[PDB]
Structure prediction request, 207 residues.
Amino acid sequence: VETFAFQAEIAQLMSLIINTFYSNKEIFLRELISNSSDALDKIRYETLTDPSKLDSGKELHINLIPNKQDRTLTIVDTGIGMTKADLINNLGTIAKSGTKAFMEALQAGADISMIGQFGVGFYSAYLVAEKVTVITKHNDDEQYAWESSAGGSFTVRTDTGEPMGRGTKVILHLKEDQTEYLEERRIKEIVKKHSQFIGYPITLFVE
Ligand SMILES: O=c1[nH]c2ccccc2n1-c1ccc(O)cc1O
Prediction:
């Protein structure tokens, strides 16, 4: 198990998110589904020039799996996935995002609301989760599990668990007061309101 520090600005962004009373928390699901769609688009385009890219799995979809017993909501996609390097760089640093302008924008006009337009939508997961685990398999690497309960650091380790072929699974370990996101009716309404036009099947697994 390797432990890494988040880039300073990401750590600051996470604390803000972690501690906010921002009301419209449901946007977290929109952001994760939008990230999954992007990942699926990526593997799908690459497969136009090289069909063998789908040897790890031909299905392109997104599944939502609430688990009331474990208090987890899991978002699984079969997109392009992430290499170890991608995990460390993309979830650990500002990378390609507009993080700095977002951090500045506490004086522009928008609050916590425009996160997704600044390329940092992923972190909205911390509005509802005390901890996030990301399990991922990219065609070019082994399967890895990234995890963080914020606080400034994250871990990365080889994942020997159930093989996924290719894709990314985000497991949200929900805060005790955010269990509404495990309710079928709530999940349905959020998908309909924010993600209805996503170009891949989004399937809710009923408990
Ligand atoms: O695993 C991934 N590879 C990607 C490539 C491009 C965009 C998003 C990508 N993702 C990705 C990132 C965050 C998620 O919540 C889900 C994902 O599938």
The chain has one domain: 1-207.
